[PDB]
Ligand binder design. Structure first.
Ligand SMILES: CC(=O)NCc1ccccn1
Length: 121
């Protein structure tokens, strides 16, 4: 149907916007601490602690399969990256501090992304 096509066009547009947001957020992780899933070989007990692992590579895979229907779903996954890290790692670690910095600096990006998704519809 024509409606379905229009829908898929919006989704494609959303994906374009979210790809930009994702690139901007990942730039706030220069150390690439969140680039890849935590290695279950190098951290074998990780899943005992964290029930829903997340990382930028996994987000990007979902993104390019057009797997985010709205900004909320994307933000959920971004928040998982940060929140998982701040649980697993202690306050005095380079990992925890990198999550804090990513969350702080990423807020600016997500604040404008929400305005853009709303405005463009
Ligand atoms: C993103 C994250 O939580 N990383 C923790 C970690 C991974 C490997 C070695 C030490 N610590």
């Amino acid at each position: 149907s024509m409606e379905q096509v229009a829908m898929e066009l919006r989704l494609t547009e959303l994906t374009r916007l979210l790809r930009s947001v994702l690139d901007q957020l990942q730039d706030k992780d220069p150390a690439r601490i969140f680039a890849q899933p935590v290695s279950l070989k190098e951290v074998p007990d990780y899943l005992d602690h964290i029930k829903h692992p997340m990382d930028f590579a996994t987000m990007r895979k979902r993104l390019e399969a057009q797997g985010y229907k709205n900004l909320h779903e994307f933000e959920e996954d971004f928040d998982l990256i940060i929140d998982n890290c701040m649980k697993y790692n202690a306050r005095d670690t380079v990992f925890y501090r990198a999550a804090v910095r990513l969350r702080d600096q990423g807020g600016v990006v997500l604040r404008q992304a929400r305005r853009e998704v709303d405005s463009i519809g």
